[PDB]
Design a protein around this ligand. Sequence first.
Ligand code: ZN
Length: 348
Amino acid sequence: GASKLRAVLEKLKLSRDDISTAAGMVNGVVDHLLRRLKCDSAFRGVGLLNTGSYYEHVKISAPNEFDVMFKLEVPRIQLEEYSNTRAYYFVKFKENPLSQFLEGEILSASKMLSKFRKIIKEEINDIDVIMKGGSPAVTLLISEKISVDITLALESKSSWPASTQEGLRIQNWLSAKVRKQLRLKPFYLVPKHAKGFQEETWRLSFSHIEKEILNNHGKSKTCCENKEEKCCRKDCLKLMKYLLEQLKERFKDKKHLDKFSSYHVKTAFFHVCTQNPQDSQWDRKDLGLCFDNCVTYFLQCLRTEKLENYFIPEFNLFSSNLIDKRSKEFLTKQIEYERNNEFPVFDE
DNA sequence: CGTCTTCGGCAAT
DNA sequence: AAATTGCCGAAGACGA
Ligand SMILES: [Zn+2]
């Protein structure tokens, strides 16, 4: 029902005053940490890349969860793919400020993460904030209300790795030209061990690209810039995130839904966007149909145990090695029930 | 639909 | 030398 769904979206709208106070807290702490990190020889080129739901304007309910990336431009990077995981890599260099973190010829994520956490932990000790598989490296809690997931990332301005070359299938949606422009942007490597865990791997990150697409998301260049062209893409993504968040809350005592994340819902949403490239397939009048497309596609991913990373097609976020069949069957069952009953979890 | 706020990029430092 | 900073305007909450 499109009218019930719109009522859900109204309840999900963030408070402008809450945004204001929350942003003030996050920005103060983040700037404090960046200022400290830039004083260290190792994190000399550190910069802020804001990522995730809040900076994509798909944060729901309250602005109480911020993801930030502390990125380091690194020179002359040489990637070695770990096994054939397609997303995990050993970092090498082709005399540089990260030489202390080298363990042989590979860059030690562990060594780097340790100094990163150490510096942040020390800086938080003097601030009302507290510190709490490598990425996010650190989670802050500001005034018991606001959580900040801080991810260390290497920035490579090199062309994207070969495993991405069939990814980002935006050609018929955002255009081949936009795909070419996005793939000229840097890519990021975050410390993330690969599963026995290889503790020195880095995973490809494209959070900046994900943010760019979401804030410039139409086939039409003027999508959502005027009244006539307000699509429901972000509305559906928010509904999908609320659906997952509510299901995860409703079954928090069970453990089946713990591994599912907003990134899964966001990734699925980008695939539905690829399957539905035209803004007219996201008309505001069709919020119900569009949400059901997202729900249906997500259920297909659960059932087939395939949710491709939007950028790395052979990296299956729903692989057996990542999420148990039983966890997907459980989500499938609950989503199917939810849909068959006008989504009871939305009222709560 | 105008007002207000926040964020992102980047000349100008 | 190269990291810092102020400024612009889109995005979105909000009230009228
Ligand atoms: Zn739009």
